[PDB]
Design an enzyme around this catalytic site. Structure first.
Site, PDB file in Angstrom:
ATOM      1  N   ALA A 140       3.803 -12.680  12.366  1.00  0.00           N
ATOM      2  CA  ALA A 140       2.822 -13.700  12.711  1.00  0.00           C
ATOM      3  C   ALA A 140       3.207 -15.024  12.071  1.00  0.00           C
ATOM      4  O   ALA A 140       3.533 -15.073  10.880  1.00  0.00           O
ATOM      5  CB  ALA A 140       1.429 -13.288  12.241  1.00  0.00           C
ATOM      6  N   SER A 165       0.822  -1.203   0.000  1.00  0.00           N
ATOM      7  CA  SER A 165       0.000   0.000   0.000  1.00  0.00           C
ATOM      8  C   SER A 165       0.857   1.255   0.000  1.00  0.00           C
ATOM      9  O   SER A 165       0.425   2.314  -0.476  1.00  0.00           O
ATOM     10  CB  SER A 165      -0.918   0.007   1.220  1.00  0.00           C
ATOM     11  OG  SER A 165      -1.858  -1.065   1.190  1.00  0.00           O
ATOM     12  N   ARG A 172      -3.737  -2.826 -20.133  1.00  0.00           N
ATOM     13  CA  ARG A 172      -2.429  -3.208 -19.607  1.00  0.00           C
ATOM     14  C   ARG A 172      -2.040  -4.627 -20.015  1.00  0.00           C
ATOM     15  O   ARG A 172      -0.871  -4.885 -20.314  1.00  0.00           O
ATOM     16  CB  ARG A 172      -2.383  -3.057 -18.082  1.00  0.00           C
ATOM     17  CG  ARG A 172      -3.391  -3.867 -17.298  1.00  0.00           C
ATOM     18  CD  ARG A 172      -3.134  -3.785 -15.808  1.00  0.00           C
ATOM     19  NE  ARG A 172      -3.312  -2.437 -15.304  1.00  0.00           N
ATOM     20  CZ  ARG A 172      -3.158  -2.087 -14.038  1.00  0.00           C
ATOM     21  NH1 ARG A 172      -2.808  -2.984 -13.118  1.00  0.00           N
ATOM     22  NH2 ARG A 172      -3.366  -0.825 -13.703  1.00  0.00           N
TER      23      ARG A 172
HETATM   24  C1  LIG Z   1       3.867  -0.867  -6.995  1.00  0.00           C
HETATM   25  C2  LIG Z   1       2.385  -1.072  -6.838  1.00  0.00           C
HETATM   26  C3  LIG Z   1       1.511  -0.136  -7.318  1.00  0.00           C
HETATM   27  C4  LIG Z   1       0.128  -0.276  -7.148  1.00  0.00           C
HETATM   28  N1  LIG Z   1      -0.716   0.724  -7.545  1.00  0.00           N
HETATM   29  C5  LIG Z   1      -1.988   0.591  -7.272  1.00  0.00           C
HETATM   30  C6  LIG Z   1      -2.900   1.628  -7.564  1.00  0.00           C
HETATM   31  O1  LIG Z   1      -2.567   2.711  -7.963  1.00  0.00           O
HETATM   32  N2  LIG Z   1      -4.204   1.431  -7.210  1.00  0.00           N
HETATM   33  C7  LIG Z   1      -4.648   0.266  -6.710  1.00  0.00           C
HETATM   34  O2  LIG Z   1      -5.828   0.168  -6.504  1.00  0.00           O
HETATM   35  N3  LIG Z   1      -3.835  -0.729  -6.445  1.00  0.00           N
HETATM   36  C8  LIG Z   1      -2.564  -0.587  -6.698  1.00  0.00           C
HETATM   37  N4  LIG Z   1      -1.713  -1.603  -6.401  1.00  0.00           N
HETATM   38  C9  LIG Z   1      -2.231  -2.738  -5.642  1.00  0.00           C
HETATM   39  C10 LIG Z   1      -2.453  -2.329  -4.190  1.00  0.00           C
HETATM   40  O3  LIG Z   1      -1.510  -1.333  -3.815  1.00  0.00           O
HETATM   41  C11 LIG Z   1      -2.345  -3.509  -3.228  1.00  0.00           C
HETATM   42  O4  LIG Z   1      -3.106  -4.598  -3.697  1.00  0.00           O
HETATM   43  C12 LIG Z   1      -2.810  -3.148  -1.820  1.00  0.00           C
HETATM   44  O5  LIG Z   1      -2.151  -1.974  -1.376  1.00  0.00           O
HETATM   45  C13 LIG Z   1      -2.588  -4.242  -0.807  1.00  0.00           C
HETATM   46  O6  LIG Z   1      -2.994  -3.752   0.466  1.00  0.00           O
HETATM   47  P1  LIG Z   1      -3.139  -4.746   1.688  1.00  0.00           P
HETATM   48  O7  LIG Z   1      -3.481  -3.940   2.855  1.00  0.00           O
HETATM   49  O8  LIG Z   1      -3.951  -5.905   1.354  1.00  0.00           O
HETATM   50  O9  LIG Z   1      -1.650  -5.285   1.830  1.00  0.00           O
HETATM   51  P2  LIG Z   1      -0.217  -4.635   1.957  1.00  0.00           P
HETATM   52  O10 LIG Z   1      -0.297  -3.212   1.684  1.00  0.00           O
HETATM   53  O11 LIG Z   1       0.700  -5.446   1.178  1.00  0.00           O
HETATM   54  O12 LIG Z   1       0.130  -4.831   3.477  1.00  0.00           O
HETATM   55  C14 LIG Z   1       0.241  -6.098   4.074  1.00  0.00           C
HETATM   56  C15 LIG Z   1       1.265  -6.010   5.182  1.00  0.00           C
HETATM   57  O13 LIG Z   1       1.235  -7.211   5.987  1.00  0.00           O
HETATM   58  C16 LIG Z   1       2.533  -7.548   6.352  1.00  0.00           C
HETATM   59  N5  LIG Z   1       2.606  -8.945   6.622  1.00  0.00           N
HETATM   60  C17 LIG Z   1       2.569  -9.939   5.730  1.00  0.00           C
HETATM   61  N6  LIG Z   1       2.720 -11.111   6.272  1.00  0.00           N
HETATM   62  C18 LIG Z   1       2.890 -10.853   7.617  1.00  0.00           C
HETATM   63  C19 LIG Z   1       3.088 -11.663   8.744  1.00  0.00           C
HETATM   64  N7  LIG Z   1       3.239 -12.973   8.692  1.00  0.00           N
HETATM   65  N8  LIG Z   1       3.192 -11.050   9.931  1.00  0.00           N
HETATM   66  C20 LIG Z   1       3.087  -9.729   9.989  1.00  0.00           C
HETATM   67  N9  LIG Z   1       2.907  -8.872   9.000  1.00  0.00           N
HETATM   68  C21 LIG Z   1       2.807  -9.507   7.839  1.00  0.00           C
HETATM   69  C22 LIG Z   1       3.401  -7.134   5.172  1.00  0.00           C
HETATM   70  O14 LIG Z   1       4.747  -6.977   5.550  1.00  0.00           O
HETATM   71  C23 LIG Z   1       2.722  -5.832   4.728  1.00  0.00           C
HETATM   72  O15 LIG Z   1       3.340  -4.720   5.347  1.00  0.00           O
HETATM   73  C24 LIG Z   1      -0.342  -1.443  -6.530  1.00  0.00           C
HETATM   74  C25 LIG Z   1       0.571  -2.417  -6.120  1.00  0.00           C
HETATM   75  C26 LIG Z   1       1.904  -2.220  -6.233  1.00  0.00           C
HETATM   76  C27 LIG Z   1       2.854  -3.278  -5.740  1.00  0.00           C
HETATM   77  O1  LIG Z   2      -2.443  -1.774 -10.481  1.00  0.00           O
HETATM   78  C1  LIG Z   2      -3.052  -0.693 -10.230  1.00  0.00           C
HETATM   79  O2  LIG Z   2      -4.201  -0.666  -9.694  1.00  0.00           O
HETATM   80  C2  LIG Z   2      -2.384   0.632 -10.522  1.00  0.00           C
HETATM   81  C3  LIG Z   2      -1.137   0.724 -10.942  1.00  0.00           C
HETATM   82  C4  LIG Z   2      -0.621   2.138 -11.134  1.00  0.00           C
HETATM   83  C5  LIG Z   2       0.217   2.585 -12.099  1.00  0.00           C
HETATM   84  N1  LIG Z   2       0.389   3.873 -11.901  1.00  0.00           N
HETATM   85  C6  LIG Z   2      -0.321   4.237 -10.828  1.00  0.00           C
HETATM   86  N2  LIG Z   2      -0.946   3.158 -10.354  1.00  0.00           N
END
Ligand SMILES: Cc1cc2nc3c(=O)[nH]c(=O)nc-3n(C[C@H](O)[C@H](O)[C@H](O)COP(=O)(O)OP(=O)(O)OC[C@H]3O[C@@H](n4cnc5c(N)ncnc54)[C@H](O)[C@@H]3O)c2cc1C
Ligand SMILES: O=C(O)/C=C/c1c[nH]cn1
Ligand SMILES: Cc1cc2nc3c(=O)[nH]c(=O)nc-3n(C[C@H](O)[C@H](O)[C@H](O)COP(=O)(O)OP(=O)(O)OC[C@H]3O[C@@H](n4cnc5c(N)ncnc54)[C@H](O)[C@@H]3O)c2cc1C
Ligand SMILES: O=C(O)/C=C/c1c[nH]cn1
Ligand SMILES: [Cl-]
Ligand SMILES: [Cl-]
Ligand SMILES: [Cl-]
Ligand SMILES: [Cl-]
Ligand code: NA
Ligand code: NA
Lengths: 454, 454
Positions: free
Chosen positions: A157, A43, A283
């Site tokens: 965890a 995130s 994409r």
């Molecule tokens: C570079 C990039 C750009 C993106 N851009 C976009 C975008 O513009 N818009 C969009 O909608 N989506 C985007 N995505 C997708 C989106 O950002 C992610 O799917 C989303 O942020 C995931 O959020 P989350 O809270 O599920 O997990 P995360 O943000 O991945 O957080 C999970 C956390 O849990 C922790 N964790 C994992 N396992 C354990 C454990 N065993 N014990 C403790 N902690 C643990 C990890 O270390 C991590 O910090 C992007 C993804 C990436 C990689």
């Molecule tokens: O995978 C997404 O939801 C977005 C990727 C992205 C690229 N530039 C800004 N966000």
């Protein structure tokens, strides 16, 4: 050492922060445990663009939208395999989620910019200041400190604790080489993200996505939450559906947000010096186009005129420096120099750009029908970046209901266990649309904290 | 009985007719052998819309196009797996092919209508008078009779005759329960079409496309040309890539050309009385959307106002009668009657159409973002048709070079053997674009007749 909280949240991404703030606001004690030394997960490094139908920004910009269209766009994007109620609940709560980020977390969004990701029928992605998740996670962190939500970093965890009734009542975690027991009086929220950076899990569920591909994600995206829940018989679904992002570092796997210049006129050039796909195509089309080019990579080329509108170099200076040091990016004065640095045939590149300049002047791209209109590239300086697809998001994961309760292999609620975010597997079908991960993680993170606190 | 001709052509579709007319025009003797009692194959029952970049009709309509864009559109449509030289030769010869149909075969095309199939960046499909292949095959048949090209119907090729040097020197065929030997002094042209109506071959190469699906094609589309050539070690490729068409008869498998009304305002309604996909989405998206609806079918609904512009009922009266007799189509006075005849919930249908009428008035479809604008459906009469996807075209088939010479498993030319049309497997990649079969069969049919005659 042992701790006791009402709600124990695993992961400090957008889903976990949302759950934690809701649990605290409900009057419960809560903690986030985070295995990395830093908070925010994927995130944090996200573009953090977030789809909302009916936002204040759409109103500012004169853009009409509807929940019905956002739902139909989303379901179609995942080949009609997403759970309709999961998509409906996401869309129905998206306005509230984004207004909550704005008003409660104090996230700043541009008031007059929106992005239209592929598959969305109208511009509906809110854009955080700075065009990354840095704004989102920094504001979450400040708000968590203000309200009294502790975050325990370097705490991994490893095991869910299940009592003889089948209820999840805590988490065993590792910290500094010792096991720490976290007792959870009301609920455990799994908010651990996806498994884009777990090579063995990728290969198990989608053998094509092997060592040939990097990951755009952080090193902690390893599927731990799925593994820990399956051990206590949580169900998983859609694990084989794993999406890539087309324009990423061939060395590190990182996304190239700096190459969002392609939405403002940058062109994709192959090793032969030729354009080969409309730069604004979907994409997955671009990914396949790149993998069909010599060497399975592309260049992305643009000039100062494009940067002066797009700002993607200014906004992503860490990428500029990293890609440049890796030999993947050059800033050059002339197209001739752009060709030289990457051994691109000069005559072909110049001919390609001559055509681009003509197409920019007329508005008619006679080679690939660029849908918004090319921009003249006759004058520099220029950036040229080498890029290839990288593994990006795991649509599959844990089975939950719309209250984020984790279900077992017979569809029965596992008491005390909730999950939200990329760790779940029912929202996005076969393919997540751009901008829909952020909507999912905030909407369902909030629900998970609310439900765990009850 | 035995016959001797310079060129023996197997199949009387567009590819075979094109080859035959070229062979005769070159001063050679030629015959077409056709296993059915009627001529024309799938080319006859085709819509026969034919893509051309740079046509006289585009000029009449003020539409600019380019070969570069037609090539890039086509290659992208097949997921970049098509042979680039096969696509280039198709596009490079498309204008000549269509002008030859116009000037030599005397096919009449509308001078001021074009269709833009999904995946094409501009309107470029020429439309024969009557919006079917009837015009094309009838004019071919007249021209063949004028120039002295015999066609032997009820004559089924069963075996290629190969001499000890490896050259193909004739065809053994069955007619009236006897074997007839066709000696070919200069060449045999395989122009037998696809295998959409061969259930066992479908299941072998694409197990999903089993008895659950019909075929839009005639009963003779059974892959014979592939089988006969493989017996003498011709190579085949891409056999598993088999496309369906979304809007077809659930009873017979036939395409519903009458439902091209969806390009003029007809709406797709599921059994629940609701719209569920943009009616102008890509055909594979619509197919998947339909298969996600209750019962895996859709209704197609439109009124007299749409027919008065679209003419698809007037142009396809045989479909009207057949679908109506099969209980798949009704003409009704009111939406209430449209709901009744198919047990559609009346209140939901009326509510859906109320929305459609509002969207038609504003030009803004708030449910599915119809890209051209809906048409008011408040007044009848109405047609309502039940439809489902059916197997439509086999992209795979024989390996040829751009001179239509059939290649063996080591890439070596098989002397005396040529192939053109849907029987070949290198033009369309993983997925043919609409309107590109006709371009392929005429361009390469002509080349095959030219090359066989040399
Ligand atoms: C570079 C990039 C750009 C993106 N851009 C976009 C975008 O513009 N818009 C969009 O909608 N989506 C985007 N995505 C997708 C989106 O950002 C992610 O799917 C989303 O942020 C995931 O959020 P989350 O809270 O599920 O997990 P995360 O943000 O991945 O957080 C999970 C956390 O849990 C922790 N964790 C994992 N396992 C354990 C454990 N065993 N014990 C403790 N902690 C643990 C990890 O270390 C991590 O910090 C992007 C993804 C990436 C990689
Ligand atoms: O995978 C997404 O939801 C977005 C990727 C992205 C690229 N530039 C800004 N966000
Ligand atoms: C309903 C329908 C609509 C279509 N609409 C369009 C459209 O608008 N535009 C477009 O581009 N494409 C369209 N297509 C696809 C296109 O029409 C076909 O791919 C194309 O016409 C095939 O031409 P062909 O010459 O290869 O084969 P065919 O036209 O199928 O002819 C092959 C002939 O060979 C004969 N034959 C086969 N085996 C033997 C044998 N052993 N001995 C003797 N004869 C044999 C068959 O009986 C048949 O008559 C459509 C297809 C269908 C079914
Ligand atoms: O499959 C094609 O190329 C065209 C199908 C079609 C539908 N209506 C007219 N042609
Ligand atoms: Cl709404
Ligand atoms: Cl599954
Ligand atoms: Cl041209
Ligand atoms: Cl193959
Ligand atoms: Na997931
Ligand atoms: Na084929």
């Amino acid at each position: 050492m042992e701790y006791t909280y009402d709600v124990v949240i695993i992961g400090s991404g957008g889903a976990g922060f949302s759950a934690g703030l809701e649990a605290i606001a409900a009057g419960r004690s809560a903690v986030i445990i985070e295995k990395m030394p830093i908070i925010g997960g994927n995130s944090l490094i996200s573009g953090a663009e977030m789809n909302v139908a009916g936002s204040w920004v759409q109103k500012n910009m004169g853009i009409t939208d509807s929940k019905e269209l956002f739902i139909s766009d989303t379901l179609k994007g995942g080949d009609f395999k997403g759970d309709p109620e999961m998509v409906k609940t996401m869309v129905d709560n998206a306005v509230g989620a984004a207004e909550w980020l704005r008003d409660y977390v104090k996230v700043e969004f541009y008031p007059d910019q929106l992005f239209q990701f592929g598959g969305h029928s109208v511009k509906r992605a809110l854009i955080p200041k700075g065009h990354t998740g840095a704004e989102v996670i920094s504001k979450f962190s400040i708000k968590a400190d203000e309200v009294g939500l502790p975050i325990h970093t370097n705490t991994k965890a490893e095991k869910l604790i299940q009592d003889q009734t089948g209820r999840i009542v805590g988490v065993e975690a590792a910290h500094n080489g010792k096991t720490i027991t976290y007792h959870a009086k009301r609920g455990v929220v799994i908010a651990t993200g996806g498994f884009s950076s777990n090579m063995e899990m990728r290969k198990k569920y989608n053998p094509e996505l092997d060592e040939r591909y990097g990951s755009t994600g952080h090193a902690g995206g390893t599927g731990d939450g799925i593994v820990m829940a399956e051990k206590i018989h949580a169900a998983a679904k859609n694990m084989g559906y794993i999406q890539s992002y087309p324009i990423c570092s061939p060395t590190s796997g990182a996304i190239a947000l700096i190459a969002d210049s392609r939405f403002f006129g940058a062109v994709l050039i192959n090793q032969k010096g030729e354009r080969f796909v409309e730069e604004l195509e979907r994409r997955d089309v671009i990914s396949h186009a790149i993998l069909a080019q010599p060497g399975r990579y592309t260049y992305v080329l643009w000039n100062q005129d494009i940067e002066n509108v797009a700002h993607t170099v200014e906004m992503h200076q860490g990428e500029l420096k990293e890609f440049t040091k890796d030999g993947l990016m050059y800033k050059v004065d002339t197209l001739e120099e752009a060709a030289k640095v990457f051994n691109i045939p000069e005559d072909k590149l110049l001919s390609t750009i001559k055509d681009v300049n003509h197409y920019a002047a007329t508005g008619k791209d006679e080679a690939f029908n660029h849908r918004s209109g090319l921009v003249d590239l006759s004058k520099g300086p220029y950036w040229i970046l080498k890029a290839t697809p990288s593994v990006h998001h795991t649509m599959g994961g844990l089975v939950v209901d719309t209250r984020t309760r984790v279900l077992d292999e017979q569809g029965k609620v596992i008491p005390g266990l909730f999950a939200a975010g990329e760790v779940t597997g029912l929202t996005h079908g076969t393919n997540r649309l751009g901008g829909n991960a952020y909507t999912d993680i905030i909407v369902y993170g909030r629900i998970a904290g609310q439900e765990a606190a009850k």
